[PDB]
Amino acid sequence: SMSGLHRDFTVASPAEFVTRFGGDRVIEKVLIANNGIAAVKCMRSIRRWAYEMFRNERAIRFVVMVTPEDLKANAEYIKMADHYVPVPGGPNNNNYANVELIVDIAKRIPVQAVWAGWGHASENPKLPELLCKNGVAFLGPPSEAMWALGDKIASTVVAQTLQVPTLPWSGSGLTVEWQGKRISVPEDVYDKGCVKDVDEGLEAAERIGFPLMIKASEGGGGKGIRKAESAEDFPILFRQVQSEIPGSPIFLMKLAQHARHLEVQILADQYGNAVSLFGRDCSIQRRHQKIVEEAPATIAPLAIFEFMEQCAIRLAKTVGYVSAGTVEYLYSQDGSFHFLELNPRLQVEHPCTEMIADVNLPAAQLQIAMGVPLHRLKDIRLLYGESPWGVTPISFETPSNPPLARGHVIAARITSESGTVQELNFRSSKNVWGYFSVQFGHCFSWGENREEAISNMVVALKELSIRGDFRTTVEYLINLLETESFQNNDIDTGWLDYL
């Protein structure tokens, strides 16, 4: 995982840093509630920052969890960490996703914090909840924020309240009344967004139009989802969704007719300040999978993408968000965008943004978790044109130097033809780096401009193809990246099919 690329700008210990930087809580021992690439990038990013600040890569100790599997396969993440605690094997609910387990190990060590990144319990509000109730910090939003955010039903009411365009759904039109105190959606208004039976489901279904999606809020992970295309199928489809994720609330939402998928990168401290770090473009997908990703998103006019940025920050500030998160939008060929959801966690394609904005996200996460306020994070100060170590307040809303992304990035999701994660090296192109977890992986390419970004990524995939387990699986990526349609960044993405 890439960590990036006279006075004394260093302290002697976490303690001094917390004190010196307006911090309010010292975290020097962290438990990583995850494994694989997530566990690797978390350590690498933080340790890079630890070295820059303490001239000691180990200043922030790490304790990881190891299932009898990862352990036997010799996952690299195991020897990297400072301490590791062996955990039960089997599905994640017996480990990396078992919340009681995490807080239990978190308490016994003890650590001052936990990081889960993405996957597993990363989005389960009961984790930060149980952690705080035992005085263990969380490198992610507080349970209140995720609560106040809720599932799609709740968050959509909130986007709507804040007047953010949304796709027509069973809850279209619902809002709540809106100094402090985060927003909350009444249990009664929430139910007005669901559907209890085929009777009322069909009702709303007619008001929305076909085709549409039948989705269970508790659903997710390939479950609790269906595509209704006619009133003659709604009944069986709706009952299908019921039998798959029983008891779950269900809602309907219009099926977006092939548009762009844009993301906004949010970063917020524990004081009310939240900023955007440009966004990502992930309109290229192969069967519900983000294959190729861009950064920033150029497809959309800076004026319109900047507005999405503001709404996103608004949305975040309202739920009292903390740390990093993603707000997904749906930009249309003409100029219409709709809020889709907010990711209460860091994503795997984050290195894109780290690359165009020079921000070490996991390190930001850790400093915010110690109470350091945005204007006191070196990476942000620099991004805002300020002093690397000044104490000066930064006006994020109306900055004197509106940050500009440095370059363009391309990200490709790759697949194969001891260890769990393999770091990739390229003698060919030099603005590319990647990893491969053994199954899937990612490659990140930097370029002075989009052209060079695409170019480099390609020359890299080719070097990649020399590898045995990569003689075919990445061929279509190269062909795809070289297609003229992609070359000119056509607003239309249809061409992805007849490839």
Side-chain angles (χ1 to χ4, degrees), residues 141-150 182 319-322:
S143 46
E144 303 65 36
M146 295 171 90
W147 276 147
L149 191 76
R182 63 185 77 193
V319 306
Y321 203 73
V322 184

Side-chain angles (χ1 to χ4, degrees), residues 217-494:
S217 67
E218 311 196 321
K223 285 183 134 298
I225 181 77
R226 243 55 160 195
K227 192 186 74 172
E229 293 175 297
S230 74
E232 299 132 303
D233 287 307
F234 190 92
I236 288 194
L237 295 179
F238 179 93
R239 290 206 180 65
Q240 225 152 73
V241 181
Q242 298 192 107
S243 293
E244 196 155 292
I245 315 296
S248 169
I250 301 178
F251 67 95
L252 315 179
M253 191 188 71
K254 189 58 176 176
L255 187 60
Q257 297 171 61
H258 219 181
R260 308 293 290 213
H261 284 276
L262 308 190
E263 300 195 316
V264 185
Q265 178 60 63
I266 288 293
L267 185 65
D269 61 34
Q270 318 188 314
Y271 304 104
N273 303 107
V275 291
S276 65
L277 294 179
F278 311 97
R280 295 190 279 284
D281 181 280
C282 31
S283 318
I284 288 64
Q285 314 187 199
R286 269 153 54 72
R287 317 306 297 190
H288 309 288
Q289 207 73 193
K290 293 177 182 172
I291 302 309
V292 174
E293 205 145 300
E294 295 200 28
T298 58
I299 191 67
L302 191 52
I304 299 179
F305 182 77
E306 285 182 3
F307 186 29
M308 295 183 261
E309 281 184 345
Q310 276 103 55
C311 304
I313 303 160
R314 281 227 300 294
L315 180 57
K317 290 192 177 167
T318 295
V319 306
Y321 203 73
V322 184
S323 192
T326 305
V327 183
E328 297 172 41
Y329 287 102
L330 200 55
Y331 177 70
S332 174
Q333 339 296 73
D334 43 283
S336 60
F337 74 84
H338 309 86
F339 160 94
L340 289 170
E341 45 158 350
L342 190 165
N343 258 297
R345 60 168 169 62
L346 189 66
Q347 297 164 283
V348 70
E349 296 86 340
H350 75 282
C352 294
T353 284
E354 292 187 300
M355 282 176 243
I356 61 167
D358 293 350
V359 188
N360 177 322
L361 284 166
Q365 289 187 298
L366 179 63
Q367 304 176 74
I368 286 169
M370 287 189 262
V372 177
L374 259 37
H375 69 103
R376 297 286 262 117
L377 299 168
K378 197 268 301 172
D379 290 356
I380 296 298
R381 299 196 60 69
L382 296 188
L383 174 75
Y384 269 84
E386 292 302 309
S387 185
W389 319 97
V391 189
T392 312
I394 299 171
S395 188
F396 299 128
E397 173 177 354
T398 47
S400 61
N401 291 298
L404 306 175
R406 187 207 82 199
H408 194 87
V409 177
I410 302 302
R413 184 195 171 71
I414 60 179
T415 48
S416 177
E417 193 81 43
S418 67
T420 56
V421 59
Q422 179 195 54
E423 195 166 11
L424 292 182
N425 298 69
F426 302 114
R427 316 192 57 172
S428 310
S429 184
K430 54 185 179 180
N431 294 310
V432 174
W433 71 264
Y435 67 99
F436 193 79
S437 42
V438 311
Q439 179 164 168
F440 81 89
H442 284 71
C443 266
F444 300 89
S445 165
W446 183 81
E448 12 303 331
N449 64 187
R450 178 154 190 290
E451 137 73 76
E452 277 305 312
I454 312 179
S455 172
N456 296 183
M457 168 56 86
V458 173
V459 196
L461 292 179
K462 285 176 189 168
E463 186 189 312
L464 219 195
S465 53
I466 300 156
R467 261 95 157 178
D469 46 10
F470 287 110
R471 60 184 293 293
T472 328
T473 53
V474 309
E475 230 58 55
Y476 86 93
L477 286 178
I478 300 170
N479 296 149
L480 178 154
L481 291 182
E482 270 155 347
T483 70
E484 179 144 67
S485 206
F486 179 66
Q487 299 292 183
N488 309 307
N489 200 183
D490 288 353
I491 183 63
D492 113 70
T493 61

